[PDB]
Amino acid sequence: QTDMSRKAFVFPKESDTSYVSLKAPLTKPLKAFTVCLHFYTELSSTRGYSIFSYATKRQDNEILIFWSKDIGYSFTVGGSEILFEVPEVTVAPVHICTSWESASGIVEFWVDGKPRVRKSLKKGYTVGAEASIILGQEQDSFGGNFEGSQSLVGDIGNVNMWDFVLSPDEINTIYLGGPFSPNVLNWRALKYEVQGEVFTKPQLWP
Amino acid sequence: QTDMSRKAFVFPKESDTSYVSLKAPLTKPLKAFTVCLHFYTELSSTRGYSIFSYATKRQDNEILIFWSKDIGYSFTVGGSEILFEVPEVTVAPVHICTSWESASGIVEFWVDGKPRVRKSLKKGYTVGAEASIILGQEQDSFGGNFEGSQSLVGDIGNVNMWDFVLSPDEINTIYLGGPFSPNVLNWRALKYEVQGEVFTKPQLWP
Amino acid sequence: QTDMSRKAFVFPKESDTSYVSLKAPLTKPLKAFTVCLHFYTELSSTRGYSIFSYATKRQDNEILIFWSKDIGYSFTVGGSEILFEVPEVTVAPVHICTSWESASGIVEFWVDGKPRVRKSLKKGYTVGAEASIILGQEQDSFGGNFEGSQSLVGDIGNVNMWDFVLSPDEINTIYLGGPFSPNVLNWRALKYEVQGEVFTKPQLWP
Amino acid sequence: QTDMSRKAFVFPKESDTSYVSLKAPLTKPLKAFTVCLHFYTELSSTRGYSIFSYATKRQDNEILIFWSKDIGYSFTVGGSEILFEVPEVTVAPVHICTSWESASGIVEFWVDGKPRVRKSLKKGYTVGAEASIILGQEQDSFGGNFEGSQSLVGDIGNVNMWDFVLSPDEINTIYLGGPFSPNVLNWRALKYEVQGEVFTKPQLWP
Amino acid sequence: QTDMSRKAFVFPKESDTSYVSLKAPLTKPLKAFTVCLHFYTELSSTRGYSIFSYATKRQDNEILIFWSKDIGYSFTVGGSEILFEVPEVTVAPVHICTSWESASGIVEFWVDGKPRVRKSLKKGYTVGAEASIILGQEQDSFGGNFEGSQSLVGDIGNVNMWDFVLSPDEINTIYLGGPFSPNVLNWRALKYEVQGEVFTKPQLWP
Ligand SMILES: CCCCN(CCCC)CCCP(=O)(O)O
Ligand SMILES: CCCCN(CCCC)CCCP(=O)(O)O
Ligand SMILES: CCCCN(CCCC)CCCP(=O)(O)O
Ligand SMILES: CCCCN(CCCC)CCCP(=O)(O)O
Ligand SMILES: CCCCN(CCCC)CCCP(=O)(O)O
Ligand SMILES: [Ca+2]
Ligand SMILES: [Ca+2]
Ligand SMILES: [Ca+2]
Ligand SMILES: [Ca+2]
Ligand SMILES: [Ca+2]
Ligand SMILES: [Ca+2]
Ligand SMILES: [Ca+2]
Ligand SMILES: [Ca+2]
Ligand SMILES: [Ca+2]
Ligand SMILES: [Ca+2]
């Protein structure tokens, strides 16, 4: 357990061996979830990068948040991809929240507290519980097989994960700075593991 | 009767068989009306879509609100079309109010509480009372014959219908969030019928 | 006498025979004046139109306010024209005030409470008193000879006329909505005459 | 002495013989000064014009503020010119303050209370005391030889001149409209002389 | 010791021999530092210029802050360069803070109180203590060998240097004018040496 309030992981330069591993107390498979986080990078105009890699032994992309240059945000659960197009890209810290529900397949994508339209993806699916969560790298296998061209170079922090779907009002308090209690991943109670060239410094965003 | 406050219909993906059917207790033909609603979609840059389809046995487009790509808003009553051009299109939730009067033919179109100029359309017409109201699809016949390329993909809600013309001051309270009583269709007392892949989730707009 | 507060004239569709005739209790010829009004139309990008036509038996353009497409506002007194160029045109309600002085020829043109530079026009002239004032059409003769391509299609209201020149401080209150006592044309005590396809509905602007 | 508060000089139309002559009680030559004023004109997109002409028997451009079309602001003291480039030109009232110091050659140029970078001009010079100050025309000789193509057409006022350099804090109060005491030219105690077609009317700016 | 509060150095015109030399009480080599300053110039659109030149006998570019036209900000420590690209350049006063850490190589770059992403540079380096600090010129040798095309023409002031890395909260107060205490270079206690055509005048920014 570590209180990571006001701190953030920083990946200074592109690398093949830098990443942090988040550990989750999972026991039941997920029928829905919600992931929120902050990050800041200039790469969005040069190439793409991995933002949040959640892998399983049977599926290297169990749930992945990815930025594809010139296209926008890429959101894939269970190997199937959906896109949230973004034309104008301005370099600044950004806050994303994204949720998925099995019973309906609806996926919500919030960017800086403002919601994007709702789309479908993997209706009826069930996400694996025994996962490997990695920041700063894209997983091709369980916790391994990283591509350096998918590295994240910059700051990442404030990651929080639930096992249900957050309502608009809850998403607002999360972005606005209100008190929320995650039940999967908690920034204020993080069990993590550092590997490679990564540092912990005060966060740049408010 | 269903109180749909803070809830909205969501059509996740393009489809040919998804729609909700609103039921109206009409007895006299309409000599004027006013229709208001919220909706949110990214389609406006890809194609056009149906926003509100009100059909009669003799006229498949008794009153229709439609978005034509690259042109703007399309408003047709009794088969006759009038346009409200829109050059710049920004993706976000939008609130539309539109009214029509027979004695004058004047049509008003409000977008996010700001009015567009007044135009003429079907002066002296009389709208049919035995209608079929459909959301998420365009009607070519009484409650049927849907085109998939006219589907609405996204959120729609807060639909309310009167049988007279609302004054500017009245429209304001509806947009600003005040307490009003619709007299044709009431979001707070909706008799509807769901069909296909459609869901009811908390609304995204305030 | 009619109190026209909060009401406005609407010319829904293009026509050749629609207009209202304002009646003025004039006795002395005008050595200066000031005219203010609201209007709202989309025509500004399609063609030109007449906003306020003040005609005399000897001069069909005794004082005329006109929008010439691609050029801007046209202001002519006694047959002589002056232009206030406008490059960017955005469709929305607009408030114009315009004054003329004989002793100096100075003309002011205020748009939405913001003034344009001062220009000269017909120094020493004297405007006729026995006039015909028409809204929605352009006069080629005393109260007649309308051209349909000069029609005004939209809303017009809040027209008020003085027989002297209004100061900046006064113009401000008129735009902001303060109490003024006109002595030629008074919206709150209007003697007018309707003709053709014209209607009276609540005003759209605040 | 005349208090010209809230009133302004207006040059309605282009002319060769319209101008006002400001009279200054000078006795010592100027080793530094500061000039502030308001003005409003549409010419900036058509041609250039003279804003403030201070001439001597030996030097027709002892200190001149000039707008050169497509280039920006032109500032010349003692016959030597320096430029403050301006790319985008928007038509509205503008407030300029400009100062010069001999010991350093530093010139400051403030536009609407915001400063431009500092530049050099005529270090060690000494400005003549027996000058002719003219508004609305450009001087080629002592109080004469006007070029009509250099006329200023519009409003000008609030001109005030010191014999020292105003600090940033002081410039702010001058722009905001606070109590300042000029010791060369004072709007509230102006000894001037009108000639030609020029008028005194209330100012358009606040 | 000199208190330079509210004052700033001015380099009026391009020159080869104008510069101020800041003197620092250094004894130990720097394992990290942070530099903050204000500056204002129009050159950014014409050519590049030196902002802050810190040279050693063995390295003419021990730490240099430089603006390269059409590219953005150039930041080099120990001869190795890293870039913070800037596409749009608007002329106005600007406040920059920049820090470097040896243990991590992380460099932060704050512009007008807003941070750019974190990058790596010269991890494990050690900056020399016996340095020559120059403003307004670029050093090719210890305190000499200036290129005129690298001159800074405009205002510079409020320069402050620490020997550690400032946190986001500290950078904020420094931008706003907080009670910060530098321990290398202090604007409120500057031991400097002036040379050439440079002047000390009140600062232009707030
Ligand atoms: C199987 C879906 C792959 C999603 N994909 C996004 C493509 C946008 C650039 C990331 C590639 C993951 P990978 O490196 O393991 O192959
Ligand atoms: C008869 C008027 C048709 C109006 N129309 C708008 C055209 C703008 C793209 C929608 C088409 C209705 P439809 O699918 O039944 O033919
Ligand atoms: C005699 C001056 C005419 C002014 N004119 C403005 C031209 C800009 C399009 C309106 C035409 C008046 P008209 O219809 O009676 O001839
Ligand atoms: C001798 C310097 C002349 C400065 N000059 C500015 C040129 C920018 C268009 C105004 C011309 C003064 P002039 O009319 O007496 O010749
Ligand atoms: C050795 C690195 C040089 C950095 N450089 C920035 C280049 C961007 C225009 C300034 C040149 C220093 P110099 O004048 O001594 O050669
Ligand atoms: Ca993968
Ligand atoms: Ca990979
Ligand atoms: Ca149809
Ligand atoms: Ca259809
Ligand atoms: Ca006509
Ligand atoms: Ca005429
Ligand atoms: Ca001259
Ligand atoms: Ca001349
Ligand atoms: Ca160098
Ligand atoms: Ca050099």
Numbering used by the authors:
A (entry chain D), B (entry chain C), C (entry chain B), D (entry chain A), E (entry chain E): 1 to 206
From the paper:
As proof‐of‐concept we present the data for a tool compound C10M, (3‐(dibutylamino)propyl)phosphonic acid, a monovalent CRP inhibitor with a molecular weight of just 250 Da. The asymmetric unit consisted of four CRP pentamers with the A‐faces stacked against each other. All of the pCRP monomers within the asymmetric unit had a C10M molecule bound. The location of the C10M molecules confirmed that the tool compound binds to the PC/PE binding pocket, with the phosphonate moiety being the main mediator of the interaction with pCRP via the calcium cations. Residues Asn 61 and Gln 150 are in hydrogen bonding distance of oxygen atoms of the C10M phosphonate moiety, as observed in the PC:pCRP complex. In contrast to the positively charged quaternary amine of PC, which interacts with Glu 81 via a salt bridge, the tertiary amine of C10M appears to form hydrogen bonds with Glu 81. The n‐butyl amine substituents of C10M make numerous hydrophobic contacts with pCRP residues (a full list of putative interacting pCRP residues is given in Table EV1). The C10M:pCRP complex retains the pentameric shape of circulating pCRP and, apart from the occupied PC/PE binding pocket, the remainder of the B‐face is available for partner proteins to interact. The A‐face of the C10M:pCRP complex is unhindered, hence proteins which usually interact with the A‐face of circulating pCRP should be unaffected by the bound C10M.
